[PDB]
Ligand binder design. Structure first.
Ligand SMILES: CCCCS(=O)(=O)Nc1ccc2c3c(cccc13)C(=O)N2CC
Length: 131
């Protein structure tokens, strides 16, 4: 009962080599504190790279989720100074959580994992430094 699975999209872009560099205290906090905390969490592992929805057989994932996002992407974006400001990075974290909550049933393990990361995220974002 084989069906066409299609392809995963290319991973989100993580490099903008000709963007001028600008560090901000908020971007520094996101990289060195927020991302580090979530990355090392026991439930981070499914979120550390783009979801392979094809190989995991997640039906209709790319029809439902218009903007895939993951912490591996966010990490590389931060490291490469891809983000112009901290709100762009926070938007990506939110997109990652939103996608998981939209696609999956509320009881599911992956949702519980995302919720644990989001609770920690919001704790750290509460102490985001002023601009
Ligand atoms: C419950 C932990 C399952 C981790 S997994 O590697 O076996 N499968 C999944 C990885 C990433 C995602 C999902 C999702 C739904 C169902 C299974 C999995 C999903 O939304 N993601 C992206 C976080």
């Amino acid at each position: 009962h084989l069906v066409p699975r299609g392809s995963n999209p290319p991973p989100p872009e993580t490099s903008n080599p000709n963007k001028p560099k600008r560090q901000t205290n908020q971007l520094q906090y996101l990289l060195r504190v927020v991302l580090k905390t979530l990355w090392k969490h026991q439930f981070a592992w499914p979120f550390q790279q783009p979801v392979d929805a094809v190989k995991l057989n997640l039906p209709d994932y790319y029809k439902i989720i218009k903007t895939p996002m993951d912490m591996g992407t966010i990490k590389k974006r931060l490291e490469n100074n891809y983000y112009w400001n901290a709100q762009e990075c926070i938007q990506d974290f939110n997109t990652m959580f939103t996608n998981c909550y939209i696609y999956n049933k509320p009881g599911d393990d992956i949702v519980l994992m995302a919720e644990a990361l989001e609770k920690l995220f919001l704790q750290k974002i509460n102490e985001l430094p002023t601009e």
